[PDB]
Structures are given as structure tokens and as C-alpha cells.
Amino acid sequence: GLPVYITPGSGQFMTTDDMQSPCALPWYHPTKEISIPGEVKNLIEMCQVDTLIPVNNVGNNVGNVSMYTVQLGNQTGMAQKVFSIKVDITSTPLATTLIGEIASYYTHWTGSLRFSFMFCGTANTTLKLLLAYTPPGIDEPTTRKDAMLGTHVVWDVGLQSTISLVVPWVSASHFRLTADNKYSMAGYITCWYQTNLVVPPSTPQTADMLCFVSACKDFCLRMARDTDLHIQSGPIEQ
């Protein structure tokens, strides 16, 4: 018959290939597929929903919930600093986040990102923080002035309550690596006081702010790979 030549790759097996296989159970008509509210079609979707950020990434706090709140304090001094985290989306505190947890399934990431903060303060309470995105290039800023110099957003706490800070995409390589890499260093984001936290009489003087991160329509990932954030130093029983 057809003079054929069997090619090199032939007979192999790849955990990543698109090929057909005789279906055992011929003539089987599967249960119909009823209608079910909420079906996904793209990881992306999940990536665009803001999940909460562990940031109070500190000691005893960590195994608890607090590990999620950031109390905005006193501050005797002025123009003092709140916190910082680095943008490299696979870096505790980030990592664990619905996003992070994910990204860690792919080798490369890209686009803008969104950080949102909420005031679990009081009503009569007031404040004004300055948040900033310090692109890759230098060291996480020691001072506000130094950080205010780049990308930022002044946040006026008020009747609203949620300020969303965007993290533009600044990079040389259209794409960044999800894995820790000195090169693909995305930078830092930090928060400082613009004014203070003023509270009229008989209101607490510390209060919390929750923070979150969802994606931007910018966003996109690639090169699927097995995760980081989960070592099954098992096995698993029965």
C-alpha cells in the first residue's frame, strides 16, 4: 500500500498533545448538559476579580486574619511612611492572591495591574494617604519626596472609601517572567501619609485599611508550567 515513512517522534507520548483516541464505550449518549449559572471560559476572568492581600506579612500576625489589615496609626512625626510591597506578582505577600496563585502556573506575565485600598476607618474620621509605584530601576524609596517623584496617586479618604491605584506597565521586554528574576524586576509600590488621620472626639485613633489587587484588561499570561506555591510533601491517603 501507501509507501510511508515513519517519522522521528513517532510512537512517543507527550503530556501536551492534541490527538484522537478510540473511545471505549461506543454508542454512549452522555447526560444532557443542563443550564448552570456561572461558567468560566478564561482564567483571565478570575484574574480580574480583586482578591485581598496579606500584607501585614508580619510574624505572629501571619497565621491569623489580621495578616490582611494594615492599621493606619498615630504618627507623631509627619510625612511618615506606611508600608511597601514589591510588584513582582509571585512574591509573598502578593503570590497567595487569586492572581499570584495563578500566575505561578505560567512562566511569563504582562500588562498593567490594579491595586485597590479601602478604609475600614470610621465615618467622622479623615485622612489622606499618598500611594506610589516606583518602577524598576532603583531601590524602594526610603523617603516620600523620593517616591512621589514617580508614579503615584494622592488618596482623599471621604464619603467614597476606595481608591484604586493603577500600576502601568513599564518594562523593556514586552514580557516579564513570573519567576524571581533580577532582570524582570517589576518594582515597588509604597504608601505614605499626605496629611494625617484626624478624628473628632471619642473616636478611635487607629483604624484599618484593607488592600486588594485585580488585573487590568492589559493583562495576559503564557507558557503554562506547574506551580510554585504548593509542594505536596505527602502523599495523600484514603
Partner: protein
């Protein structure tokens, strides 16, 4: 379609338009996340953006390239015996099918509440020679749907498969592979469940009450050989033509046991991936 599908440009992401400054009233950067909804703010909103025509596809970010990848879900083992061949419960394996006997993959699904798909099973038998010559070791992998004679031992009457499926692989001839329709009495495979067997304060509760899909029984047909062996037939699984409903938060605690959520480690404190910081002030 082709180009778009060959070039893999099916799901493309929008581009980043150009912006100008805004000394205006409506503040898009301000929303109240308590509404439970998600913000809608973009680069163009917050900054003075430029103009970048994108070219990234969200193709590989599809429940089919996220799910559609083969994964070890079971490692059937047979330390043959020649002393007693047959005997009860020997030289033949029986496994009850499930995607959670192996973290890795179990993990991955669990990302969703409900799932559905046609499954492709690939068998990778590996014959370890513990003898000076392995001969010709034929093999039979029979699929036993629920409520069926499961071989008591090696040559029952059930290995006749007069109406069952048995795939045969003989040393040399390639890896056996076969597809299977979505098997569930339900419209979808229950990745989870908050139900029980009954009111019996001793009833079962989990992803088990629901999915009991039968078993796979392995046999090494060939009869008695001289020089021993041990067979290790690996079971890989791929999800083709998949759908998923209601996403869930991933798992961060190493499980134990299947068909259960239970984490509570044997003594050891419950460990998670989160790392500790000295101070929030420096990252």
C-alpha cells in the same frame, strides 16, 4: 480562523490608548469595593498613557489549555509472584478512579466547583527486570463500571470482558491510549459536594457520596514466567472538551486523603505558602 487559530490570535487583549490630563469632576479612581463588585479602572484613566497596539492572546488562558494537559493520577504496581499464582487478591490490581489521589492535578481542578469533560487516559507500563530475562509480558487493563464482578483474583471469569472494556498491551507495541465520554448521571462532575449519604449520623459527606465511577483492574495475562518482574503501569489523564462553573480560591494547605478537604496535619502546625516579613516598611 486558521491564521487566527494557527497563529493563536483568537482571544486578543485590547490596546492601551492615549490619554491627556484631566482636571475634572468625575473621579473614576474612587469606587466602593464594598458593593462587592470589581473596579473598572485602567491605565488610560490614572495616567497619561501613550498608544500601544497589543498582540497578546488569552488563548493559553482558557479552561482548555489550563486543564487539557496529561497528569499522573495513579501508579498501578504489581510485584509479581510465581510461587502462588492466582490466590486471592494477587498479581492483579484494582483501582477506583479519581482525580484526587495525586495533588498536582487535583489542585488545578479544585479551582472550580463544577467541571465536565471527556477524558483521555494514557497508560505507561514500565517493566522492571528483576530477572535475567523478562520474556513476553502481555497485559490486560479492564475497566469495571459500578456494580460489576471485580476479579477476586487474577483469572476470574470477569477477564472474559464479554461486555466490558479491556485494552491489551504487549511489550514493544506503544503506549495504550483511549478516550472516554463524560460519565456522570449528573450534568457535570461534582468537584465538591455539601451533601451526605443520608440522615444517619454516620452517613458519608463529600465528593464521594456522588462520584463513584467504577474501577480499573490490571492483569498480566502471560501466565507463569521464570525470571521475576515488577510492573508499574502509570495512569495519565487529560481533559478534552472541558467546561467549568463557579471558580474557587486555590488550595494553600497540603491535603491528605481524598474526597475530603481536611488539612489538619498529623501534629505539625498547619503550614501554608505565606512567607514572613520583618517589617511592612521594607519589601
Amino acid at each position: 480562523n486558521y491564521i487566527d487559530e494557527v497563529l493563536n490570535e483568537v482571544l486578543v487583549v485590547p490596546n492601551i490608548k492615549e490619554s491627556h490630563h484631566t482636571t475634572s469632576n468625575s473621579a473614576p479612581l474612587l469606587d466602593a469595593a464594598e458593593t462587592g463588585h470589581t473596579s473598572n479602572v485602567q491605565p488610560e484613566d490614572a495616567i497619561e498613557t501613550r498608544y500601544v497596539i497589543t498582540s497578546q492572546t488569552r488563548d493559553e488562558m482558557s479552561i482548555e489549555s489550563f486543564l487539557g494537559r496529561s497528569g499522573c493520577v495513579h501508579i498501578s504496581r504489581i510485584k509479581v509472584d510465581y510461587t502462588d499464582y492466582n490466590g486471592q487478591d494477587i498479581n492483579f490490581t484494582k483501582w477506583k478512579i479519581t482525580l484526587q489521589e495525586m495533588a498536582q492535578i487535583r489542585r488545578k481542578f479544585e479551582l472550580f466547583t463544577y467541571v465536565r469533560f471527556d477524558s483521555e487516559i494514557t497508560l505507561v507500563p514500565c517493566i522492571a527486570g528483576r530477572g535475567d530475562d523478562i520474556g513476553h509480558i502481555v497485559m490486560q487493563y479492564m475497566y469495571v463500571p459500578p456494580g460489576a464482578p471485580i476479579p477476586s483474583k487474577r483469572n476470574d471469569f470477569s477477564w472474559q470482558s464479554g461486555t466490558n472494556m479491556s485494552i491489551f498491551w504487549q511489550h514493544g507495541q506503544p503506549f495504550p491510549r483511549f478516550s472516554i465520554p463524560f460519565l456522570s448521571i449528573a450534568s457535570a462532575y461534582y468537584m465538591f459536594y455539601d451533601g451526605y449519604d443520608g440522615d444517619n449520623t454516620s452517613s458519608k459527606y463529600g465528593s464521594v457520596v456522588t462520584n463513584d465511577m467504577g474501577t480499573i483492574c490490571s492483569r498480566i495475562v502471560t501466565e507463569k514466567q521464570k525470571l521475576s518482574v515488577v510492573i508499574t503501569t502509570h495512569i495519565y489523564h487529560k481533559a478534552k472538551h472541558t467546561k467549568a462553573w463557579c471558580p474557587r480560591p486555590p488550595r494553600a494547605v497540603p491535603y491528605t486523603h481524598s474526597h475530603v478537604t481536611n488539612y489538619m496535619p498529623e501534629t505539625g502546625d498547619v503550614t501554608t505558602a505565606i512567607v514572613r516579613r520583618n517589617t511592612i516598611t521594607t519589601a
